[PDB]
Amino acid sequence: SMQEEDTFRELRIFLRNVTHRLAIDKRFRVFTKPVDPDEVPDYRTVIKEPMDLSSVISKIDLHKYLTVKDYLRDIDLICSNALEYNPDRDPGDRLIRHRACALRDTAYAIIKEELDEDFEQLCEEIQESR
């Protein structure tokens, strides 16, 4: 229906706004663009599904997310990729992991305060119905 297409448009507006707030935070700069294969040729052989905040913006616009749960699977994949690729005790690795965990916890906290649970339940029921 028209009403269902209006529900999914509101979902996209909400997701662009959360993603822009993460992307301007100086802590999360390393997560804003894909890894350059020239700089890190080993990256694409270790990490099977790369993900970053520029790709998440592109996926919102392509209508890839029908629920906030779909969207948070990609935020969780940005975080898990960083913990897998950078697992060592040295400071460079410990700083990337700390920032990855902060990206994940910040996205979950914005959504806890600002997403209405009945708006998410509506998105999930339209998705199920298709």
Ligand X SMILES: O=C(C1CC1)N1CCN(c2ccc(F)cc2)CC1
Residues near ligand X (CB under 6 A) are: 30-31, 35, 39-40, 82, 85-86, 96
Nearer to ligand X, 68 or 82 (CB): 82
Nearer to ligand X, 56 or 123 (CB): 56
Report, in Å, the least distance between residue 86 CB and ligand X. 5
Report which residue type is found at 3: Q
What angle is formed at CA 59 by the lines to CA 12 and CA 69, rounded to 5 degrees? Answer: 60
The contacts of residue 80 (CB under 8 Å, 6+ apart) are none
Nearer to ligand X, 55 or 86 (CB): 86
Confirm if 107 and 18 have CB atoms less than 8 A apart: yes
